[PDB]
Structure formats: C-alpha cells, structure tokens
mmCIF file of C-alpha atoms and ligand atoms in Angstrom:
data_model
loop_
_atom_site.group_PDB
_atom_site.id
_atom_site.type_symbol
_atom_site.label_atom_id
_atom_site.label_comp_id
_atom_site.label_asym_id
_atom_site.label_seq_id
_atom_site.Cartn_x
_atom_site.Cartn_y
_atom_site.Cartn_z
ATOM 1 C CA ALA A 2 -6.302 53.027 12.390
ATOM 2 C CA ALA A 3 -6.807 50.104 10.014
ATOM 3 C CA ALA A 4 -6.750 46.479 11.169
ATOM 4 C CA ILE A 5 -4.769 43.984 9.132
ATOM 5 C CA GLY A 6 -5.417 40.503 7.779
ATOM 6 C CA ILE A 7 -2.547 38.040 8.123
ATOM 7 C CA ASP A 8 -2.207 34.674 6.388
ATOM 8 C CA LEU A 9 0.370 32.953 8.622
ATOM 9 C CA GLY A 10 1.360 30.187 6.226
ATOM 10 C CA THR A 11 3.287 26.942 6.521
ATOM 11 C CA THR A 12 5.805 28.145 3.924
ATOM 12 C CA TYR A 13 4.879 31.766 3.072
ATOM 13 C CA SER A 14 2.949 34.492 4.869
ATOM 14 C CA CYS A 15 0.991 37.419 3.482
ATOM 15 C CA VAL A 16 -0.574 40.595 4.908
ATOM 16 C CA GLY A 17 -3.289 42.851 3.521
ATOM 17 C CA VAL A 18 -5.349 45.830 4.608
ATOM 18 C CA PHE A 19 -8.817 47.046 3.699
ATOM 19 C CA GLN A 20 -8.525 50.812 3.293
ATOM 20 C CA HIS A 21 -10.484 53.275 1.150
ATOM 21 C CA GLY A 22 -13.031 50.712 -0.022
ATOM 22 C CA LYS A 23 -10.601 48.063 -1.274
ATOM 23 C CA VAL A 24 -8.022 45.523 -0.144
ATOM 24 C CA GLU A 25 -4.337 46.082 -0.807
ATOM 25 C CA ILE A 26 -1.893 43.233 -0.318
ATOM 26 C CA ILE A 27 1.281 44.763 1.085
ATOM 27 C CA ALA A 28 4.677 44.069 -0.478
ATOM 28 C CA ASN A 29 7.726 43.642 1.764
ATOM 29 C CA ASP A 30 11.050 45.554 1.624
ATOM 30 C CA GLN A 31 12.221 43.431 -1.320
ATOM 31 C CA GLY A 32 8.971 44.054 -3.200
ATOM 32 C CA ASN A 33 7.561 40.561 -2.599
ATOM 33 C CA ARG A 34 3.822 40.272 -1.888
ATOM 34 C CA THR A 35 4.394 37.119 0.183
ATOM 35 C CA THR A 36 7.233 36.504 2.646
ATOM 36 C CA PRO A 37 8.776 33.114 3.590
ATOM 37 C CA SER A 38 7.796 31.828 7.038
ATOM 38 C CA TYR A 39 11.497 31.500 7.925
ATOM 39 C CA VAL A 40 13.526 32.643 10.932
ATOM 40 C CA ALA A 41 17.322 32.431 11.067
ATOM 41 C CA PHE A 42 19.766 32.860 13.951
ATOM 42 C CA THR A 43 23.415 33.774 13.332
ATOM 43 C CA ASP A 44 26.407 34.796 15.444
ATOM 44 C CA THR A 45 25.227 38.420 15.203
ATOM 45 C CA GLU A 46 21.591 38.742 14.077
ATOM 46 C CA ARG A 47 18.123 37.258 13.911
ATOM 47 C CA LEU A 48 16.870 37.205 10.299
ATOM 48 C CA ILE A 49 13.187 36.880 9.347
ATOM 49 C CA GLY A 50 11.493 36.249 6.009
ATOM 50 C CA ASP A 51 13.403 36.784 2.768
ATOM 51 C CA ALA A 52 16.672 37.491 4.601
ATOM 52 C CA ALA A 53 16.307 34.195 6.452
ATOM 53 C CA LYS A 54 15.360 32.114 3.411
ATOM 54 C CA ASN A 55 18.121 33.706 1.320
ATOM 55 C CA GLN A 56 20.842 32.386 3.668
ATOM 56 C CA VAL A 57 19.290 28.955 4.373
ATOM 57 C CA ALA A 58 22.087 27.137 2.493
ATOM 58 C CA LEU A 59 24.729 28.916 4.604
ATOM 59 C CA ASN A 60 23.074 28.087 7.927
ATOM 60 C CA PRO A 61 20.812 24.981 7.881
ATOM 61 C CA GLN A 62 21.053 24.113 11.601
ATOM 62 C CA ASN A 63 19.921 27.576 12.717
ATOM 63 C CA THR A 64 17.379 28.422 9.996
ATOM 64 C CA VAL A 65 13.923 27.486 11.281
ATOM 65 C CA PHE A 66 10.890 26.863 9.070
ATOM 66 C CA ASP A 67 7.751 24.696 9.204
ATOM 67 C CA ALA A 68 6.946 25.983 12.717
ATOM 68 C CA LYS A 69 3.247 25.788 11.792
ATOM 69 C CA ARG A 70 3.610 21.990 11.742
ATOM 70 C CA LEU A 71 4.649 22.096 15.425
ATOM 71 C CA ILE A 72 2.492 24.921 16.775
ATOM 72 C CA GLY A 73 0.125 23.938 19.570
ATOM 73 C CA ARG A 74 1.135 20.257 19.498
ATOM 74 C CA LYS A 75 2.602 18.123 22.266
ATOM 75 C CA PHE A 76 6.106 16.707 21.840
ATOM 76 C CA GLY A 77 4.786 13.136 21.790
ATOM 77 C CA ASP A 78 2.299 13.900 19.006
ATOM 78 C CA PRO A 79 3.049 11.389 16.205
ATOM 79 C CA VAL A 80 3.007 14.292 13.732
ATOM 80 C CA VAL A 81 5.852 15.959 15.647
ATOM 81 C CA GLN A 82 7.824 12.724 16.009
ATOM 82 C CA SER A 83 7.425 12.054 12.280
ATOM 83 C CA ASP A 84 8.127 15.558 10.946
ATOM 84 C CA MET A 85 11.237 16.112 13.078
ATOM 85 C CA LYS A 86 13.144 13.283 11.375
ATOM 86 C CA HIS A 87 13.407 15.439 8.233
ATOM 87 C CA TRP A 88 14.296 18.921 9.537
ATOM 88 C CA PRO A 89 17.936 20.101 9.702
ATOM 89 C CA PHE A 90 17.273 21.988 12.955
ATOM 90 C CA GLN A 91 16.978 20.416 16.392
ATOM 91 C CA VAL A 92 13.655 19.876 18.171
ATOM 92 C CA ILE A 93 13.777 19.127 21.919
ATOM 93 C CA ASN A 94 11.265 18.236 24.627
ATOM 94 C CA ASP A 95 10.489 20.809 27.346
ATOM 95 C CA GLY A 96 7.737 19.377 29.555
ATOM 96 C CA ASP A 97 6.069 17.492 26.672
ATOM 97 C CA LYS A 98 6.106 20.654 24.553
ATOM 98 C CA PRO A 99 8.392 20.846 21.500
ATOM 99 C CA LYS A 100 10.971 23.605 21.262
ATOM 100 C CA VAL A 101 13.355 24.440 18.428
ATOM 101 C CA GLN A 102 16.976 24.610 19.601
ATOM 102 C CA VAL A 103 19.459 26.833 17.738
ATOM 103 C CA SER A 104 22.663 28.774 18.268
ATOM 104 C CA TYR A 105 22.257 32.558 18.407
ATOM 105 C CA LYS A 106 24.991 35.082 19.206
ATOM 106 C CA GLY A 107 27.258 32.219 20.287
ATOM 107 C CA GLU A 108 24.836 30.542 22.715
ATOM 108 C CA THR A 109 22.352 27.679 22.625
ATOM 109 C CA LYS A 110 18.739 28.867 22.864
ATOM 110 C CA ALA A 111 15.369 27.156 22.444
ATOM 111 C CA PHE A 112 12.069 28.663 21.319
ATOM 112 C CA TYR A 113 8.512 27.406 21.418
ATOM 113 C CA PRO A 114 6.855 27.187 17.974
ATOM 114 C CA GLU A 115 4.574 30.081 18.885
ATOM 115 C CA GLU A 116 7.670 32.191 19.551
ATOM 116 C CA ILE A 117 9.049 31.380 16.090
ATOM 117 C CA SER A 118 5.673 32.207 14.548
ATOM 118 C CA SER A 119 5.528 35.437 16.572
ATOM 119 C CA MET A 120 8.713 36.553 14.817
ATOM 120 C CA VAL A 121 7.134 35.882 11.407
ATOM 121 C CA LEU A 122 4.059 37.837 12.542
ATOM 122 C CA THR A 123 6.267 40.707 13.763
ATOM 123 C CA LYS A 124 7.721 40.912 10.257
ATOM 124 C CA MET A 125 4.262 40.973 8.678
ATOM 125 C CA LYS A 126 3.210 43.656 11.170
ATOM 126 C CA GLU A 127 6.257 45.773 10.269
ATOM 127 C CA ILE A 128 5.609 45.230 6.553
ATOM 128 C CA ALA A 129 2.124 46.698 7.062
ATOM 129 C CA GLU A 130 3.372 49.559 9.258
ATOM 130 C CA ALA A 131 5.921 50.633 6.636
ATOM 131 C CA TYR A 132 3.106 50.785 4.088
ATOM 132 C CA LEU A 133 0.514 52.444 6.344
ATOM 133 C CA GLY A 134 2.911 54.823 8.100
ATOM 134 C CA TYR A 135 1.676 54.178 11.652
ATOM 135 C CA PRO A 136 1.702 51.302 14.171
ATOM 136 C CA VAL A 137 -0.716 48.408 13.674
ATOM 137 C CA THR A 138 -2.428 46.948 16.740
ATOM 138 C CA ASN A 139 -5.427 44.848 15.566
ATOM 139 C CA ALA A 140 -5.368 41.810 13.287
ATOM 140 C CA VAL A 141 -7.320 38.833 12.017
ATOM 141 C CA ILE A 142 -5.086 35.755 11.690
ATOM 142 C CA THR A 143 -6.064 32.658 9.707
ATOM 143 C CA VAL A 144 -5.527 28.938 10.464
ATOM 144 C CA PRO A 145 -6.306 25.639 8.718
ATOM 145 C CA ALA A 146 -9.821 24.352 9.280
ATOM 146 C CA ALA A 147 -8.328 21.225 10.906
ATOM 147 C CA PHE A 148 -6.636 23.230 13.689
ATOM 148 C CA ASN A 149 -7.794 22.234 17.172
ATOM 149 C CA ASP A 150 -8.283 24.415 20.257
ATOM 150 C CA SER A 151 -4.618 24.146 21.295
ATOM 151 C CA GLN A 152 -3.329 25.043 17.825
ATOM 152 C CA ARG A 153 -5.677 28.032 17.679
ATOM 153 C CA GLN A 154 -4.621 29.081 21.177
ATOM 154 C CA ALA A 155 -0.928 28.975 20.231
ATOM 155 C CA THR A 156 -1.521 30.928 17.020
ATOM 156 C CA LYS A 157 -3.368 33.589 19.019
ATOM 157 C CA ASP A 158 -0.465 33.616 21.492
ATOM 158 C CA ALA A 159 1.962 34.178 18.611
ATOM 159 C CA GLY A 160 -0.086 37.239 17.673
ATOM 160 C CA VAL A 161 -0.112 38.525 21.257
ATOM 161 C CA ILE A 162 3.674 38.064 21.464
ATOM 162 C CA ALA A 163 3.984 40.139 18.259
ATOM 163 C CA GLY A 164 2.009 42.933 19.926
ATOM 164 C CA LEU A 165 -1.244 42.333 18.060
ATOM 165 C CA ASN A 166 -4.761 42.355 19.398
ATOM 166 C CA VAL A 167 -6.130 39.261 17.637
ATOM 167 C CA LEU A 168 -9.695 40.245 16.702
ATOM 168 C CA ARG A 169 -10.500 36.718 15.509
ATOM 169 C CA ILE A 170 -8.857 33.511 14.372
ATOM 170 C CA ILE A 171 -10.705 32.424 11.218
ATOM 171 C CA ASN A 172 -10.332 29.367 9.005
ATOM 172 C CA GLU A 173 -8.334 29.694 5.785
ATOM 173 C CA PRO A 174 -11.143 28.384 3.501
ATOM 174 C CA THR A 175 -13.631 30.800 5.082
ATOM 175 C CA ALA A 176 -11.221 33.700 4.500
ATOM 176 C CA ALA A 177 -10.827 32.688 0.841
ATOM 177 C CA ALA A 178 -14.607 32.645 0.382
ATOM 178 C CA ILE A 179 -14.909 36.072 2.039
ATOM 179 C CA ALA A 180 -12.284 37.441 -0.376
ATOM 180 C CA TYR A 181 -14.599 36.624 -3.293
ATOM 181 C CA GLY A 182 -17.669 38.049 -1.529
ATOM 182 C CA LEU A 183 -19.360 34.650 -1.326
ATOM 183 C CA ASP A 184 -21.049 35.331 2.039
ATOM 184 C CA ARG A 185 -23.063 38.420 1.058
ATOM 185 C CA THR A 186 -26.326 36.843 -0.153
ATOM 186 C CA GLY A 187 -29.384 36.222 1.996
ATOM 187 C CA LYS A 188 -31.395 33.040 2.414
ATOM 188 C CA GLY A 189 -30.314 30.279 0.080
ATOM 189 C CA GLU A 190 -27.644 27.598 0.155
ATOM 190 C CA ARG A 191 -24.521 28.147 -1.923
ATOM 191 C CA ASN A 192 -21.950 25.347 -2.172
ATOM 192 C CA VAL A 193 -18.330 26.447 -2.529
ATOM 193 C CA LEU A 194 -15.207 24.370 -3.101
ATOM 194 C CA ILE A 195 -11.879 25.733 -1.866
ATOM 195 C CA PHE A 196 -8.943 24.042 -3.650
ATOM 196 C CA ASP A 197 -5.810 25.064 -1.708
ATOM 197 C CA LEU A 198 -2.404 23.820 -2.932
ATOM 198 C CA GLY A 199 0.394 25.698 -1.198
ATOM 199 C CA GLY A 200 4.090 25.172 -0.657
ATOM 200 C CA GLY A 201 3.745 22.259 1.729
ATOM 201 C CA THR A 202 0.105 21.195 2.119
ATOM 202 C CA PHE A 203 -2.964 20.481 -0.016
ATOM 203 C CA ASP A 204 -6.430 21.161 1.437
ATOM 204 C CA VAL A 205 -9.853 20.789 -0.196
ATOM 205 C CA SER A 206 -12.827 22.220 1.675
ATOM 206 C CA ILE A 207 -16.484 22.118 0.683
ATOM 207 C CA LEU A 208 -18.456 24.910 2.334
ATOM 208 C CA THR A 209 -22.170 25.605 2.290
ATOM 209 C CA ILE A 210 -22.960 29.277 2.841
ATOM 210 C CA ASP A 211 -26.482 30.307 3.814
ATOM 211 C CA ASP A 212 -27.336 33.890 4.796
ATOM 212 C CA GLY A 213 -23.712 34.623 5.702
ATOM 213 C CA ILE A 214 -23.307 31.499 7.869
ATOM 214 C CA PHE A 215 -20.510 29.075 6.926
ATOM 215 C CA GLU A 216 -20.927 25.309 7.343
ATOM 216 C CA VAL A 217 -18.108 22.906 6.514
ATOM 217 C CA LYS A 218 -19.604 19.953 4.667
ATOM 218 C CA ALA A 219 -16.386 18.072 3.908
ATOM 219 C CA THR A 220 -12.614 18.340 3.964
ATOM 220 C CA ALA A 221 -9.859 16.331 2.292
ATOM 221 C CA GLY A 222 -6.253 16.649 1.228
ATOM 222 C CA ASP A 223 -2.656 15.733 2.017
ATOM 223 C CA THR A 224 -0.497 17.534 4.574
ATOM 224 C CA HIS A 225 2.701 16.663 2.646
ATOM 225 C CA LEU A 226 1.847 17.582 -0.946
ATOM 226 C CA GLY A 227 2.730 21.009 -2.286
ATOM 227 C CA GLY A 228 5.022 23.194 -4.328
ATOM 228 C CA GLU A 229 8.133 21.916 -2.545
ATOM 229 C CA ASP A 230 7.434 18.457 -3.988
ATOM 230 C CA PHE A 231 7.356 19.946 -7.496
ATOM 231 C CA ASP A 232 10.649 21.741 -6.802
ATOM 232 C CA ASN A 233 12.098 18.395 -5.703
ATOM 233 C CA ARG A 234 11.160 16.791 -9.029
ATOM 234 C CA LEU A 235 13.013 19.559 -10.860
ATOM 235 C CA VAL A 236 16.007 19.178 -8.525
ATOM 236 C CA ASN A 237 16.348 15.447 -9.244
ATOM 237 C CA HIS A 238 16.007 16.172 -12.984
ATOM 238 C CA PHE A 239 18.792 18.735 -12.898
ATOM 239 C CA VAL A 240 21.009 16.560 -10.694
ATOM 240 C CA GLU A 241 20.771 13.919 -13.418
ATOM 241 C CA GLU A 242 21.411 16.501 -16.141
ATOM 242 C CA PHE A 243 24.516 17.725 -14.303
ATOM 243 C CA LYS A 244 25.767 14.139 -13.944
ATOM 244 C CA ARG A 245 25.411 13.550 -17.683
ATOM 245 C CA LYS A 246 27.003 16.856 -18.672
ATOM 246 C CA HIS A 247 29.952 16.951 -16.242
ATOM 247 C CA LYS A 248 30.121 13.381 -14.836
ATOM 248 C CA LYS A 249 29.929 14.770 -11.281
ATOM 249 C CA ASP A 250 27.252 13.818 -8.745
ATOM 250 C CA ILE A 251 26.257 16.836 -6.634
ATOM 251 C CA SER A 252 23.523 15.108 -4.620
ATOM 252 C CA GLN A 253 25.576 14.653 -1.419
ATOM 253 C CA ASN A 254 26.784 18.298 -1.259
ATOM 254 C CA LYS A 255 24.080 19.869 0.921
ATOM 255 C CA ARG A 256 24.875 23.424 -0.192
ATOM 256 C CA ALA A 257 24.784 22.725 -3.946
ATOM 257 C CA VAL A 258 21.439 20.919 -3.645
ATOM 258 C CA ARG A 259 19.900 23.752 -1.626
ATOM 259 C CA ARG A 260 21.109 26.327 -4.182
ATOM 260 C CA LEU A 261 19.849 24.235 -7.097
ATOM 261 C CA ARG A 262 16.511 23.990 -5.289
ATOM 262 C CA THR A 263 16.301 27.789 -4.996
ATOM 263 C CA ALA A 264 16.900 28.187 -8.716
ATOM 264 C CA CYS A 265 14.308 25.471 -9.416
ATOM 265 C CA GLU A 266 11.611 27.272 -7.382
ATOM 266 C CA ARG A 267 12.310 30.431 -9.369
ATOM 267 C CA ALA A 268 12.166 28.655 -12.732
ATOM 268 C CA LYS A 269 8.952 26.903 -11.664
ATOM 269 C CA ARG A 270 7.317 30.265 -10.934
ATOM 270 C CA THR A 271 8.429 31.570 -14.334
ATOM 271 C CA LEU A 272 6.832 28.562 -16.054
ATOM 272 C CA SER A 273 3.403 29.639 -14.779
ATOM 273 C CA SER A 274 3.559 32.675 -17.099
ATOM 274 C CA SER A 275 6.093 31.638 -19.799
ATOM 275 C CA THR A 276 6.632 28.369 -21.675
ATOM 276 C CA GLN A 277 10.395 28.221 -20.929
ATOM 277 C CA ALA A 278 12.703 29.270 -18.104
ATOM 278 C CA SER A 279 16.475 29.645 -17.840
ATOM 279 C CA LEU A 280 18.583 28.503 -14.891
ATOM 280 C CA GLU A 281 22.004 30.083 -14.376
ATOM 281 C CA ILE A 282 23.804 28.942 -11.229
ATOM 282 C CA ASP A 283 27.341 30.264 -10.843
ATOM 283 C CA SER A 284 29.791 27.816 -9.279
ATOM 284 C CA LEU A 285 27.216 25.158 -8.450
ATOM 285 C CA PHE A 286 29.801 22.446 -7.733
ATOM 286 C CA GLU A 287 33.616 22.576 -7.761
ATOM 287 C CA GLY A 288 33.571 25.847 -9.702
ATOM 288 C CA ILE A 289 31.454 24.368 -12.499
ATOM 289 C CA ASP A 290 28.692 26.722 -13.557
ATOM 290 C CA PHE A 291 25.289 25.315 -14.492
ATOM 291 C CA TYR A 292 23.513 27.161 -17.302
ATOM 292 C CA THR A 293 20.504 25.312 -18.697
ATOM 293 C CA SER A 294 16.784 25.653 -19.355
ATOM 294 C CA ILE A 295 13.467 23.892 -18.767
ATOM 295 C CA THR A 296 10.219 23.992 -20.741
ATOM 296 C CA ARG A 297 6.750 24.145 -19.226
ATOM 297 C CA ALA A 298 5.874 20.891 -21.011
ATOM 298 C CA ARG A 299 8.895 19.120 -19.504
ATOM 299 C CA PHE A 300 8.022 20.427 -16.036
ATOM 300 C CA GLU A 301 4.455 19.141 -16.429
ATOM 301 C CA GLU A 302 5.780 15.729 -17.467
ATOM 302 C CA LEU A 303 8.064 15.535 -14.413
ATOM 303 C CA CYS A 304 5.130 16.262 -12.074
ATOM 304 C CA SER A 305 2.210 14.715 -13.973
ATOM 305 C CA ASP A 306 1.407 12.128 -11.293
ATOM 306 C CA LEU A 307 1.633 14.684 -8.481
ATOM 307 C CA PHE A 308 -0.662 17.158 -10.256
ATOM 308 C CA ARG A 309 -3.190 14.427 -11.022
ATOM 309 C CA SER A 310 -3.185 13.173 -7.414
ATOM 310 C CA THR A 311 -4.971 16.357 -6.323
ATOM 311 C CA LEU A 312 -8.255 15.283 -7.967
ATOM 312 C CA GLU A 313 -8.914 12.259 -5.735
ATOM 313 C CA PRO A 314 -9.339 14.402 -2.572
ATOM 314 C CA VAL A 315 -11.824 16.532 -4.557
ATOM 315 C CA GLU A 316 -13.754 13.369 -5.447
ATOM 316 C CA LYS A 317 -13.621 12.196 -1.829
ATOM 317 C CA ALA A 318 -14.768 15.568 -0.467
ATOM 318 C CA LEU A 319 -17.705 15.616 -2.893
ATOM 319 C CA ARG A 320 -18.637 12.094 -1.771
ATOM 320 C CA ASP A 321 -18.520 13.047 1.917
ATOM 321 C CA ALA A 322 -20.547 16.220 1.251
ATOM 322 C CA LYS A 323 -23.221 14.258 -0.690
ATOM 323 C CA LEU A 324 -22.883 16.691 -3.599
ATOM 324 C CA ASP A 325 -22.438 16.251 -7.326
ATOM 325 C CA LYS A 326 -19.866 18.330 -9.234
ATOM 326 C CA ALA A 327 -22.634 20.393 -10.861
ATOM 327 C CA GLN A 328 -23.962 21.395 -7.429
ATOM 328 C CA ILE A 329 -20.817 23.423 -6.611
ATOM 329 C CA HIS A 330 -21.525 27.081 -7.341
ATOM 330 C CA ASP A 331 -17.985 28.507 -6.987
ATOM 331 C CA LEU A 332 -14.501 26.977 -7.358
ATOM 332 C CA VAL A 333 -11.942 29.068 -5.455
ATOM 333 C CA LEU A 334 -8.194 28.673 -6.088
ATOM 334 C CA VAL A 335 -5.968 29.173 -3.035
ATOM 335 C CA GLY A 336 -2.243 28.629 -2.614
ATOM 336 C CA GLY A 337 0.705 29.542 -4.814
ATOM 337 C CA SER A 338 0.803 26.205 -6.630
ATOM 338 C CA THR A 339 -2.660 26.779 -8.110
ATOM 339 C CA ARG A 340 -0.977 29.326 -10.367
ATOM 340 C CA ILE A 341 0.442 26.379 -12.346
ATOM 341 C CA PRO A 342 -1.520 26.221 -15.643
ATOM 342 C CA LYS A 343 -1.591 22.400 -15.696
ATOM 343 C CA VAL A 344 -3.133 22.310 -12.208
ATOM 344 C CA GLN A 345 -5.856 24.718 -13.320
ATOM 345 C CA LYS A 346 -6.531 22.636 -16.442
ATOM 346 C CA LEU A 347 -6.888 19.457 -14.380
ATOM 347 C CA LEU A 348 -9.361 21.042 -11.970
ATOM 348 C CA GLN A 349 -11.365 22.809 -14.656
ATOM 349 C CA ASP A 350 -11.517 19.614 -16.729
ATOM 350 C CA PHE A 351 -12.606 17.657 -13.639
ATOM 351 C CA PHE A 352 -15.486 20.121 -13.212
ATOM 352 C CA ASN A 353 -16.447 19.815 -16.887
ATOM 353 C CA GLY A 354 -15.384 23.325 -17.893
ATOM 354 C CA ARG A 355 -16.541 25.340 -14.869
ATOM 355 C CA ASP A 356 -15.018 28.765 -14.198
ATOM 356 C CA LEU A 357 -12.186 29.045 -11.690
ATOM 357 C CA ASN A 358 -12.140 31.989 -9.234
ATOM 358 C CA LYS A 359 -8.525 33.095 -9.667
ATOM 359 C CA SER A 360 -8.645 36.884 -10.137
ATOM 360 C CA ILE A 361 -7.015 37.345 -6.725
ATOM 361 C CA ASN A 362 -3.492 35.896 -6.675
ATOM 362 C CA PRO A 363 -4.171 32.512 -5.026
ATOM 363 C CA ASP A 364 -1.229 32.882 -2.636
ATOM 364 C CA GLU A 365 -2.855 36.155 -1.448
ATOM 365 C CA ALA A 366 -6.531 35.153 -1.297
ATOM 366 C CA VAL A 367 -6.461 34.105 2.370
ATOM 367 C CA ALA A 368 -4.847 37.354 3.543
ATOM 368 C CA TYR A 369 -7.280 39.289 1.335
ATOM 369 C CA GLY A 370 -10.310 37.715 2.998
ATOM 370 C CA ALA A 371 -8.702 38.133 6.420
ATOM 371 C CA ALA A 372 -8.262 41.856 5.726
ATOM 372 C CA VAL A 373 -11.927 42.192 4.714
ATOM 373 C CA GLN A 374 -13.028 40.428 7.881
ATOM 374 C CA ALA A 375 -10.723 42.530 10.057
ATOM 375 C CA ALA A 376 -12.368 45.675 8.655
ATOM 376 C CA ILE A 377 -15.856 44.245 9.225
ATOM 377 C CA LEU A 378 -15.051 43.391 12.849
ATOM 378 C CA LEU A 379 -14.086 47.028 13.575
HETATM 379 N N1 ADP B 1 3.622 31.779 -10.011
HETATM 380 C C1 ADP B 1 3.790 30.601 -9.369
HETATM 381 N N2 ADP B 1 3.777 29.415 -10.022
HETATM 382 C C2 ADP B 1 3.942 28.229 -9.397
HETATM 383 N N3 ADP B 1 4.147 28.149 -8.067
HETATM 384 C C3 ADP B 1 4.189 29.270 -7.304
HETATM 385 C C4 ADP B 1 4.001 30.586 -7.915
HETATM 386 N N4 ADP B 1 4.088 31.504 -6.935
HETATM 387 C C5 ADP B 1 4.308 30.836 -5.777
HETATM 388 N N5 ADP B 1 4.364 29.510 -6.013
HETATM 389 C C6 ADP B 1 4.592 28.447 -5.027
HETATM 390 O O1 ADP B 1 3.610 28.532 -4.007
HETATM 391 C C7 ADP B 1 4.113 27.856 -2.854
HETATM 392 C C8 ADP B 1 3.794 28.687 -1.602
HETATM 393 O O2 ADP B 1 2.366 28.873 -1.537
HETATM 394 P P1 ADP B 1 1.662 29.963 -0.591
HETATM 395 O O3 ADP B 1 0.170 29.781 -0.694
HETATM 396 O O4 ADP B 1 2.312 31.290 -0.886
HETATM 397 O O5 ADP B 1 2.166 29.568 0.888
HETATM 398 P P2 ADP B 1 1.624 28.463 1.934
HETATM 399 O O6 ADP B 1 1.764 27.135 1.251
HETATM 400 O O7 ADP B 1 2.555 28.657 3.083
HETATM 401 O O8 ADP B 1 0.205 28.820 2.283
HETATM 402 C C9 ADP B 1 5.617 27.695 -3.077
HETATM 403 O O9 ADP B 1 5.872 26.329 -3.411
HETATM 404 C C10 ADP B 1 5.911 28.586 -4.272
HETATM 405 O O10 ADP B 1 7.058 28.187 -5.034
HETATM 406 CL CL1 CL B 2 10.883 42.678 4.470
HETATM 407 K K1 K B 3 0.307 31.565 2.712
HETATM 408 MG MG1 MG B 4 -1.741 28.555 2.491
#
C-alpha cells in the first residue's frame, strides 16, 4: 500500500507515487500530469479539475479557484479583503471565517476554503487510485514555506476531509530539494536556491542543508506574479490584433476574453518547446473566427519586464542569506513557468552560466519530492 505525494497548488495540483524504486507522476483521466485546482458547481453536478476549468467561461459565478489564497485565513485578513475584489465568485463572512458562496443543484451553498481544497485533494486521490488499482489512505501534502500554523492546520483538515491520513505537511522548497536528492549527504553545508514561478505566485527560497537537516536562510518573491500574468499580456495583444483586423472590441464580453485566455495559455505552453504557435478560436466574437499565430520572440518581448522582475527577489534573498552567487551549490527550477526558455536564460545568466536542475518537469518537482518523503515516512 503505497503512500502518495500531493502538491496542492494555487493554480494546478499534482500527485506522484514512489513505487518499485522510482517516482511516477500520475496523469489524470485526460492524460494531464497536473490538474487545475478548480471546483465548479452546476444545476446538476460538481466538477473538479479539468472538467471544472474547461467550463469556467460558461459558469464564472460558480467556478471556484484560488482557494489556497483563502485557506486558514480569517475573513478580516487584509489578504482576503484584497483578493476578493477580483474573483467572480462570492466570498462571505461566517464567524470571521471566509466561505465561498455558490449555487449548486438550484440552491445557495457556502463552503470553507478547506472544503474546496478537500475536493481538489479527492480528485488527486482518485487519480492515484485509478493508476495504482487500490484505495490510497496515506499522503504527504506540501505547503508554501510562508504558511502559518492556521494555514497548515486547514490544509491538513482538507486532507482529512478527503479521507487521507496526512503523514506530514512539508514545505514546497524542501520537497523540491528532496526530489533532486539534495539531502542525502552527511556533514557539510550545501546551499540550495529554489526558484519557483508558478501560475499565480513567485517564490525564491535559499536553503542550507547539513546532514539531512534543512534550514531556511532567506525567502523572497511576489504572491501575484506568475504564468497568469504572462497569459494576460498575450490576451491584451490579441485583443488589439482583433480590433485592428475586424474593428470590433471584444474586451467587455466576459466569455470571449475567457476563451481567448484559454487559447493563450495553450499557445504559451507550445512556445516553450517550439518557436511559433497557432491560435484558432472558432466564433470568438459575433461569429467571427480568430485564426492567427505568435512567435516565441514576440511573446518574450510582450513579457520582457515581467520575466526580468524575477531576478530582484533572487538578489534580495542572496543579500538576506549573506551568500554570494558562487556559494549556491544547486539551482532548482520549480513551477510551470520556469519551463519558459527566456526565464531559464535570465536565471542562468544571472548565475554566470551555472547549471539549472530541470530534469524533473518543474511543475511536478514538488509532488515528486513529496512522494519520496511519503515513502521514507512509511
Ligand atoms: N510548458 C510550459 N511553458 C510555459 N508555461 C507553462 C508550461 N506548462 C505549464 N505552464 C504554466 O505553469 C503555470 C502553473 O504552474 P504549476 O507549478 O503547475 O502550478 P502552481 O502555480 O499552482 O504551483 C500555469 O501558468 C501554466 O500555464
Ligand atoms: Cl481526471
Ligand atoms: K502545483
Ligand atoms: Mg507551485
């Protein structure tokens, strides 16, 4: 009975298992090795993951995401008050705890963030069970290093609600380091930088590892910088292109923008492995189709300031850790956006040509380390 490692992510989640001497990251029913952290409520069903994200444009008020930004916080937390202004779903106050309010099967219902996250975890659990062939009961679940006691408590509660025995809650940067075997040496300090650029957040952690013991020396980043901001740059570019080509402005049609955004995320992912991508959106606006293309070089130009802004938190973290660049032994890429070639070039250039640890898909590295640690704990 194998235990699983679960990366419960702000925008995407990922599950792996250590079995037969190696980790396997487990693909979902659609074949995707990561699954959106989305939950949708309709007149007839609750949708989780791909099915939820794939109907987001049809159902914005009842499609919940970003629950990790709420989990374990009080309603009056300035983070909650700030973030809620920009979600299409309703957040309400139940005894100074936030709840998401939706319509489901014709009725108004509210859920605590940990309940939303428990549904995402249930999906990851079922993804693993379909692969393994038997029920899964034990798991390691990861959290950001910045999470406090209440946020860790609520993440553990999400796991309990999903029917998991949570063996340990471990930090995301620690899990990434474990994935690359960086905690296996004996006496001797090793300095590791984790550069984690995901869908919604950017986190830099500097760890010192000595005889298997992890010590956080410094952290930095931006909780509102990630792949979604690169998608948004492409969206605005294509809104302008559509205006020039058809003299129609689509920006106020919430459905057309959301569907253009989905095609932009897909093209962005293609540009990490090809130098050009095609977009073909049928009936984007008023029956007008939108068939166009984007080059990698144009994408880099549209995001050049955003990509470059990731280096200042690295500088700051090094300052706070009292370390020079050359004193970092390993540079570990985490998060789907670190697959972007320009991002890798910026970081490698900043470190004067140093190797990047990127042999594990960066959007899977946290789950991979979590799966290793789950096996060790058994
Ligand atoms: N090949 C790729 N190239 C560029 N971006 C990617 C690629 N694959 C995934 N992404 C982006 O990674 C982001 C999600 O990162 P991930 O680490 O999976 O989740 P999270 O941010 O929730 O931890 C999304 O913005 C997604 O579009
Ligand atoms: Cl699935
Ligand atoms: K993730
Ligand atoms: Mg992540």
